[PDB]
């Protein structure tokens, strides 16, 4: 074994070398041979009152039961805080319960491509505010909607820069407004009528290359916080477009080399830095959408389904729907997407110290049990359903003498479990 082959010179070393090791201190043991298996020691005449064997532990510290109310007074995950003392190489496992709340508020921000092919769509979305509100009455008791528009970076080569085309990027007869990156038209409000009023006043625009600059807008919607109005509720971002998307690296064609900084840069409700920061990368959006608990609904036309479906596989808590040619079906699209998103829970953890590892096992409905990366998720979660996760943590070092802490939480939610780690390195 590796208890003896460690040559433990002290009880200390003996601990860090093997979870199956124990240490004798009697000096009635006929050197490093005092470090042997818990059985190999008893078989060699070591009183259990002498075999020093520190073991890891679990102590739950906060444990409000799942609910059955303001959102913050609603509990969907338990426990909320625990302490794990970790013997090197010995996992400590605990159970997370997740219960889908019966009724939870929804903030939905409708972020719309307003390039010229979306002109007919814009005509339909004119009543979307009130129609969606009416539908949502049967989904939640507390719904708010907002609206933003995007087109493109306002620089060569993505837009034409002749004086005429800057005034009107479209044909002479088409009365398009000047190209713009992103306009935060309407912050989240419970007044659907106001959504109708404002969206009805928006002017369609245009630009030159087919992919659009919506990733610039998504980033702003994710990180602009109170300017958008997000509450700590279900946050839905509907991204509506009939084209593909620019991303990081595309900016170099326009001489834009600074990476997106992922900070808010709205002035007078407009994004002002599209000429200065590159489009975000997918990974950057992943970071910022996740961090801000945004669940994305890609409402995109048939021809770009292939692209957005791959995008959806890279962005956690996202869904894809097929938008009709004039957004006529967008309400049912949004409903279907919300239902899909709400019925799946995905756990993430914060960064662990070196030598520390985490494994998940999920226990879902109809005895569907996930392991590996699938242990982080459950699917087909209906309203009121409970699911559970067995979460195992192991230290294989002596990571610090200082305690660590990290969070486990379901993507899209503020609620989280604080896991405090303590490392047994000494006797």
């Amino acid at each position: 074994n590796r208890c003896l082959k460690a040559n433990a010179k002290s009880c200390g070393e003996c601990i860090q070398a093997g979870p199956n090791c124990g240490w004798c201190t009697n000096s009635t043991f006929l050197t490093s041979a005092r470090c042997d298996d818990l059985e190999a020691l008893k078989k060699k005449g070591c009183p259990p009152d002498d075999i020093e064997n520190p073991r890891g532990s679990k102590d739950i510290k906060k444990n409000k039961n799942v609910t059955n109310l303001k959102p913050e007074d609603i509990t969907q995950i338990q426990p909320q805080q625990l302490v794990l003392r970790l013997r090197s190489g010995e996992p400590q496992t605990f159970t997370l319960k997740f219960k889908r709340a019966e009724d939870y508020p929804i903030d939905l921000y409708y972020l719309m491509d307003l390039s010229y092919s979306m002109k007919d769509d814009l005509e339909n979305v004119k009543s979307l505010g009130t129609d969606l509100m009416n539908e949502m009455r049967r989904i939640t008791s507390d719904f708010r909607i907002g609206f933003g528009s995007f087109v493109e970076k306002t620089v060569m080569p993505y837009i034409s820069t002749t004086p005429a085309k800057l005034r009107n990027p479209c044909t002479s007869e088409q009365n398009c407004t000047t190209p713009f990156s992103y306009k935060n038209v309407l912050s989240l409000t419970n007044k659907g009528e106001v959504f109708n009023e404002l969206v009805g006043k928006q002017r369609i625009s245009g630009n030159l290359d087919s992919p659009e600059g919506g990733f610039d807008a998504i980033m702003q919607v994710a990180v602009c916080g109170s300017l958008i109005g997000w509450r700590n509720v279900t946050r839905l971002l509907v991204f509506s477009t009939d084209a593909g998307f620019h991303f990081a690296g595309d900016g170099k064609l326009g001489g834009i080399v600074l990476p997106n900084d992922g900070q808010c840069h709205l002035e007078n409700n407009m994004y002002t830095m599209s000429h200065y920061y590159d489009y975000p990368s997918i990974a950057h959006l992943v970071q910022k959408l996740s961090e801000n608990n945004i669940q994305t609904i890609f409402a995109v036309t048939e021809e770009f389904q292939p692209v957005y479906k791959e995008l959806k596989n890279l962005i956690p808590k996202s869904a894809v729907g097929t938008l009709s040619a004039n957004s006529s079906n967008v309400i049912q699209l949004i409903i279907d997407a919300y239902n899909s998103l709400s019925s799946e829970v995905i756990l993430e953890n914060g960064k662990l110290s070196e030598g520390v590892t985490i494994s998940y096992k999920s226990y879902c409905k109809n005895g569907v049990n996930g392991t590996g990366e699938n242990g982080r998720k459950c699917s087909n979660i209906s309203i009121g359903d409970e699911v559970q996760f067995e979460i195992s943590i192991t230290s294989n070092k002596c990571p610090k003498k200082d305690s660590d802490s990290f969070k486990i939480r379901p993507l899209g939610f503020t609620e989280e479990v604080e896991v405090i780690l303590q490392y047994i390195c000494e006797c």
Binding site: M156, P157, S160, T161, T162, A164, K165, L208, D209, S210, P211, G244, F247, A248, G249, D250, L253, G254, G255, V257, L258, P259, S281, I282, A283, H284, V286, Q287, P306, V307, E310, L311, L314, E348, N349, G350, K351, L352, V356, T357, I358, E373, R376
Partner: protein, 449 residues
């Protein structure tokens, strides 16, 4: 491991000029051995031209002076000289990023302005066709070469080509240009010999008339927005003595990206290599060099936005480089080796260069830039050793700026050029640009054993 990192030579250019955006070696012989540095936002003495961009000549010996490729301001539309009431320009040299690319071969220097645009002499456009200037015979003749300044205007044609966005010389001095915007950003590769360029150079006529020019063809609209020519390199991959064209196509194939190798004789497609993740920008950077001493050039491709996952489950942008070893019957589509960055948002694989054989052990080595790597995100350059089994998976050296971080990113490692011996000691040297702070750094190989 033998580059002198303790005391490299730091070149500095004008602030905000982006001095260091491109870097190159120049040797019309040897006594005039020099470093070339592109500064695409530099102001020039060209009348009426704001930030035309410049290329600096830096003689290596005992510092940097701009080369006068073009002393003139933006030309005027001849029909407006008096027919109309008010001259107007036919082209737009302001903000054109001249020196975004600088390449040299013998006593020739190619420098490109990928944001150069022009009006055409017909309907008024704002067509960023791009242009290049070619110095030949050590500055005794200067040619403009703008193969995308053609009869076929606007985005549908070559109007948005941005020719010279990437560029390279072959070993015989043939010019190879990437223009990612041709045909609604399908992108294009165009190539001509210097003789062919000089043979039809006639500045009185703005449209390109080079005869014998090689270029890729317009494809159907399903290929739009691919950016072929985002990057370019050259190497021998076809079994003859005419170097072939390696081009990045980073948005091709659903934004998975691919890299293509074109027959250097007739620009016909020979090989494709596919990226592994959507929007990872596979093809952002490309290089070709023999990394295992068998005399067959090998392919390296950068994908600096490659997102992978930590063992504890966290996604992170880190970037990845892919290496494909050539063999006598061809070259396989799946990489022999991958190298992955460790710094979140570091953009590992943003730049690649052959180093030649840095330690003279019989195997050529490679540098890979990660312009936002390092503990203060200033950028990092990794040297990877060649060997009999290919490129090593661990760097033999790691270069970082010796100056502190500042208010704005350094971009150290965003431009690289190795493979030449600057000081004649028989060990190849390395130029690293750090354009965010308007510096370039020269590293010299120290002798070994």
């Amino acid at each position: 491991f033998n580059l002198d990192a303790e005391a490299p030579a730091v070149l500095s250019g004008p602030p905000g000029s982006f001095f260091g955006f491109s870097v190159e070696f120049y040797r019309p012989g040897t006594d005039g051995v020099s470093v070339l540095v592109g500064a695409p936002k530099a102001n020039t003495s060209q009348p009426g031209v704001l930030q035309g961009g410049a290329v600096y000549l830096c003689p290596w010996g005992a510092q940097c002076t701009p080369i006068e490729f073009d002393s003139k301001g933006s030309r005027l539309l001849e029909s407006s000289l008096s027919s109309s009431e008010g001259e107007e320009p036919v082209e737009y040299k302001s903000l054109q990023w001249f020196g975004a690319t600088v390449r040299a071969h013998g006593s020739s220097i190619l420098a490109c302005a990928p944001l150069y645009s022009w009006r055409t002499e017909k309907e008024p456009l704002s067509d960023p066709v791009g242009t290049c200037y070619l110095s030949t015979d050590n500055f005794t003749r200067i040619l403009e070469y703008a193969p995308c300044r053609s009869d076929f205007s606007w985005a549908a044609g070559q109007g948005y080509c941005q020719g010279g966005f990437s560029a390279e010389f072959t070993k015989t001095g043939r010019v190879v240009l990437g223009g990612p915007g041709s045909y609604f950003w399908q992108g294009q590769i165009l190539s001509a010999t210097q003789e062919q360029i000089a043979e039809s150079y006639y500045p009185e006529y703005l449209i390109n008339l080079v005869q014998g020019q090689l270029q890729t063809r317009q494809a159907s609209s399903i290929y739009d927005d691919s950016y072929l020519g985002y990057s370019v390199a050259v190497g021998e991959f076809s079994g003859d003595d005419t170097e072939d064209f390696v081009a990045g196509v980073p948005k091709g194939n659903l934004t998975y990206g691919y890299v293509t190798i074109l027959n250097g004789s007739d620009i016909r497609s020979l090989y494709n290599f596919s990226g592994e993740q959507m929007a990872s920008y596979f093809g952002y950077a490309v290089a070709a060099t023999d990394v295992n001493g068998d005399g067959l050039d090998d392919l390296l491709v950068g994908a600096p936005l490659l997102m992978d996952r930590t063992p504890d489950g966290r996604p992170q942008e880190v970037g990845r480089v892919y290496v494909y070893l050539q063999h006598p019957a061809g070259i396989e589509p799946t990489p022999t080796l991958t190298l992955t960055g460790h710094d979140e948002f570091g953009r590992f694989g943003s730049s690649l260069t052959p180093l030649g054989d840095l330690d003279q052990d019989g195997y050529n080595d490679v540098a890979i830039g990660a312009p936002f790597g390092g503990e203060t995100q200033q950028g990092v350059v990794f040297v990877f050793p060649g060997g009999p089994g290919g490129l090593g998976s661990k760097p033999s050296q790691v270069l970082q700026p010796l100056w502190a971080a500042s208010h704005t990113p350094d971009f150290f490692g965003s431009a690289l050029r190795g493979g030449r011996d600057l000081d004649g000691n028989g060990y190849p040297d390395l130029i690293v640009g750090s354009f965010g702070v308007d510096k370039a750094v020269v590293y010299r190989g120290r002798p070994v054993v």
